[PDB]
Design a binder for these strands. Sequence first.
RNA 1: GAAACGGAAGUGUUUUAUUGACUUGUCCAUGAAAUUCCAGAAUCCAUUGCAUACGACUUUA
RNA 2: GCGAAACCACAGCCUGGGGAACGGGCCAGGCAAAAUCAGCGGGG
RNA 3: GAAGCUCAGACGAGUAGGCAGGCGUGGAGGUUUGUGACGAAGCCUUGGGCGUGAGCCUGGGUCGAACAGCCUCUAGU
RNA 4: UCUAGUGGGCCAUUUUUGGUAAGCAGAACUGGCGAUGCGGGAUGAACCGAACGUGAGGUUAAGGUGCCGGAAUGUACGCUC
RNA 5: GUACGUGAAAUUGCUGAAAGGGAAGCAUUGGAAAUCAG
Lengths: 196, 106, 169, 118, 30, 163
Amino acid sequence: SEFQKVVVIDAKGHLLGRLASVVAKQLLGGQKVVVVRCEELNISGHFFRNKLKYLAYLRKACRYNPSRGAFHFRAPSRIFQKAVRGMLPHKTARGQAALEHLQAVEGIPPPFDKQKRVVVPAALRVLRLKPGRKYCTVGRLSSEVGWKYNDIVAKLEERRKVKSAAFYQAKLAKQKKIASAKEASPVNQKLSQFGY
Amino acid sequence: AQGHRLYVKAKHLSFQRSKHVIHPGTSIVKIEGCDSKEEAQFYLGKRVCYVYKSSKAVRGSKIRVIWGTIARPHGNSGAVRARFVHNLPAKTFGSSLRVMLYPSNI
Amino acid sequence: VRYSASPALETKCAKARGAYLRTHFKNSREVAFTINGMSLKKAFIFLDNVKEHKQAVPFRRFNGGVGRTAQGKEFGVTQARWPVKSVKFFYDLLKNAEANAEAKGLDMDKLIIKHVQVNAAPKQRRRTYVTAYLSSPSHIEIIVAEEEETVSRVSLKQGAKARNLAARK
Amino acid sequence: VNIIKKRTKPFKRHQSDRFKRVGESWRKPRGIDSCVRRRFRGTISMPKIGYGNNKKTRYCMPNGLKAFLVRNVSDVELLLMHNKTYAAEIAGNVSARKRVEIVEKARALGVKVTNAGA
Amino acid sequence: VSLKKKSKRRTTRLRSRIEKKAAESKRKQK
Amino acid sequence: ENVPKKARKAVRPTKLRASLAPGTVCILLAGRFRGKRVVVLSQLEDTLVVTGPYKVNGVPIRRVNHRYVIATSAPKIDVSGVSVEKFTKAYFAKQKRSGPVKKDEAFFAENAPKNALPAERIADQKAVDAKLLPAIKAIPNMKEYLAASFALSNGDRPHLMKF
RNA sequence: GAAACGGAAGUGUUUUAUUGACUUGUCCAUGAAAUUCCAGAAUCCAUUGCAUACGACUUUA
RNA sequence: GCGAAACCACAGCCUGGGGAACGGGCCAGGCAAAAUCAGCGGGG
RNA sequence: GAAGCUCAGACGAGUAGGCAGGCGUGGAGGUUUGUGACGAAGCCUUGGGCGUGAGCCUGGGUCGAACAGCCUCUAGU
RNA sequence: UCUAGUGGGCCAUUUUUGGUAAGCAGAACUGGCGAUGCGGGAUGAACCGAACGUGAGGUUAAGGUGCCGGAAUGUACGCUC
RNA sequence: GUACGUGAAAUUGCUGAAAGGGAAGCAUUGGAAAUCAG
C-alpha cells in the first residue's frame, strides 16, 4: 500500500463496477493505472441478461447523424474504460487528465508482462460474490456483441503463459539454489532471535 | 542512492468541501501508510510541505516550497486536514506532498 | 507626423504615408498584412505578380464570401484574391518609401517592410435610390528599415555549503 | 496594534462588466426579483455595514498615519504636533517651487510625505 | 442500462399528485 | 509614549520529555546534520546540548531543539563521567551580526573551522570525546550505529515503528 | 568488445569476454565543525479531362 | 471595380428532467478540435 | 469639538411605508497671508492610498488659463 | 390623540353535508407563501431542516459515507435472482 | 498645418502579452508571469 508510479492490475476474476470504482478513485488521486487482461473481467448477472443490457446500450443513437450519435465500444478494455469514465468528472480538466492516467489493454502486452501485477480484493468475484450466483465474462459478451479479436488474444495469451511458465521455472530453480544456501549460511541460525 | 527521505509521502486529495461548496482554507491530505484516525493522531501537528518547480530562478533555485501543518483527522480511512501558509492551488489535486517527522512528540 | 510605431528613427528607417485614398479598407488591410515583413525587392515582385494574376493576396480576416483558389496554398490558406487598386496604391507608397530611403542614404539591399498599417478614413456619403453607398477610404503608412538583429544573493547557509563544496573540489 | 482590512476587492455595480453605459460605481439594485438584491449564491456582494474596519485603524494608511492634504507651508506647520499620527500629502496642483519648498519643510519637521519623490 | 420499457424515475407533477389523491382516498374511505 | 500593561506571563522552566535523558542516542530530524545519530550530553533550558562522537561521525558540540529529535531505545551511554556545566546559553551565543554589511566572500573565507573556531572549543570537544569513547567501545555496535545515518525506506511506517 | 533470445505496443532479457573501477567481509587510523536552535522535396505559373461551381482530383511538365 | 438593408440582451448540438412555459442558459448524460466554400431551408 | 469622553449588554432578512445621517453638480455671500504659465480646468493611465458605500486624494503622460477646501445660501442638481 | 401602505390570492391541515363508475363542490379554523436568502430532496413556487452583518475555530440539524461527492467497499442478523 | 484649442466613449488598425474542443461574461481561494509597496 505505497504510492507507485504505475500500478498494473491483472483484471482476471474482478468485478467490472468494483474495479472501475477503485481505479477511478486512484486516478483522481494521481496514479497511473494499467489494467491488463480485460477479457477476464466478471460481471454479476447471467450472460443473457448482460447481453440484453449491452444490446439495449446499442439502441441509444442519434436520429440525425449517428456518426455524432453514441459511440458503442465493443472491446473489453473499452468497456472497462466506459465504466471507469462514467465514475469520473470527465467534463472538467481534472477528470480529463485523470482519464489520460489510465491504460486499459487486451491481454498483457510485452511492456507489461515482465512487471508485477497486483490485484484488488475489493473487486474480486471470489471474495465478493455469493457462491451459486450466475455471472458473465466481458471477453465473452464482447465476442457476441461485435468484438472480433478474441482468437488472436487467446493465442497470444497461450504463448505468454508458456513463456512465463518457463521463466518462473528458471527463477524457481535459482531461488531453490539460494534457498538451499540459506540455512547453510550460519548467521541465519546463530543470531536469529530477532525473528528473521 | 538510498540514505535520505526523512519524510513520509502524501497526496493532496481535495479541499475540505461540502457537495457544492469548497473551503480552500483547509485541505485534505492522504498520508501513505496511515489508514485510521488513531494512526493519524501521530501525524497531527507535523509539518507538511508542498514542493514544486518554476521557470524563473529565485535565490538561485528552481524549487519553491509551501509550508503547512496537519490539524485534525478527516474521516475513518486515515485522511487528515492540513492548513498551509498559502492555500494550495486547485491544480495540485492529486499532487504529492511530503510530511516531515518534526515537530516530533516521541 | 508621428506614426503608430516607435520606429521611423533616422538610424535605420524610411517613411511613407498616403491619406484619404479611394481604396477599400478591407482589401487594403489584406494587402498590408500579406506584405508586412517582406523584403523591399520581394514585395515589388509580389505586387507585380498579383497584378499579373500569378500570385494572390490571402484574405485572412475579411474572408466572407471570398472564393477559394490554389494560389493561396503558399500562405497556408484557401481564400485569396487579387485586389488591383490596393496593390497599385501600396506599390506607389513602396516606391515613395524606397525613394525616401535613397534620399536618406540607406543600403537598398537590406531594406525590409518593418511596419505597414492601414486605418479607416472619414467615410464619404453618396446616395442610393433611400440608403447610402458609403465609401471606406484608407490611411496607409509604410516604414521600411534595413534588417538588423542573474544577481541572485546567497544566504549564509547556501554560500557556506557552496564554499565547502569548492574546498572539496 | 496592526492594520486589518476586512475586504480588498471593491464593490462593482451589477452588469458593469457587461455594459459600458453602466459605470463601475456601486448602485443598489432596485428590482423586486433581481438576483443581486435577493442575494442568491455566487453573486457579487453588497456593501454592508458589517464590512467596516476597526475604528482605531480606520482611515489609517498601511504605515498607520492618516493622510492629510497640504497645499502650502502653513498646512505643513499644522502637522508639527501630529507628525506621529498624520502624514502630509502634497496637493496635485501645487507647483514645483512650492513642492520643493514644502517637502524640505516637512523633512525639517520630521513629517512623513506620501508623495515626496514626485 | 435501464433495460426497461417504462422509466423508473417519476416527474414532479406525478409524484406530487400521489400525495394529492392518496390523501383524498383516505378521506373517501373515512 | 504609552506604557503597556504589565503582562502576567511569567517564565517557568521547561518540562522536557522524560525519554530525553542525558546519555541517549537520538536522530537529528533537521539541520545540516539531518539523520545523524548523537549522544545527548545534557538538557539546556529549551534545547539539548548534544554531540555525536566527532571521532566517529564528526558532529560537533551543538544545540538541537527537542522537537526535532527522535529518542531511541538504544542502551544508555554513560555521560556522568564528563562535566556539562560549561555548556551554557552564553557559551553557545552567536555573538551578534551587527549589520548585514558582509558576505562579500570575505566573511566566508574568514569563516569555517580553520578560522573563527577557537582552539579552546576543540579542546573541550576532544575532552568530551576522550571521556565518551571508552564507554561506546566497551558496549558493542555503538561505534558503528553512531557512525551510520538514519533514513526511511519502503514499507516503513513512522507511526508504527518504535525507536 | 563481441554471441543468443525477445514482434502483442518487440520499449528489453540472458549469456559472456577483456579490462578500468569501487570492493564495509571483518578489524583499525586520519578530516568533517562559526551551515555554533528548523527554513532532398512540395507548391505557384504551365499541362491534362479518367475530374471539376471555386478549391480539390487524375496525368504531363 | 463599386457596394447596401432588414435584424441585432447575449448567443448558438441532441436525449431525459427541470411541477408550469418547457428553454438556450440550470441538473444528469451523449459528446466536443482551427479556418472555410457551394447548396438546401428543417428549427425562430 | 459636553455636538465630547467612558463602561456594559442585547440585537442585525426585508417589499409597501416611516425616520435619520452622509457623497457628488451649477451659481451666491463669508473665509482660507488658499492653488496656478516653475502649468489651473479637462482628459488618458497595466501606478499608489482612503471610505461598507455614494465618492475622494494622489504618481506618470497629455494639456493650456483659470480653480478649490471650510460655513452658510440657492437650484433648470 | 393623528397618519403613511394594504384590505387581495395560492398551497396544505382538521372538523361535515350534498354527492358519482370517476374525480368533486360549498363552509370554519390553522399555518406556509407572499416581504425570505441558506443546507438537503440529481435540478424545482409550495417536501425535510434552518430565519441572513464581516471573519476565525469547534459542533451539529435535514440528508447522507462504492465513484462522480466531503464522509465506513463499517460491524451484526435476515430476505431477494 | 485650416479636414487647425483641449480631443473622451462607442468603433477600427498595428505592436506586445495571454487564452481558446458547441458560448462568452462574473464571483471565491491560490499558483504562474508582470508590477508596486513597505
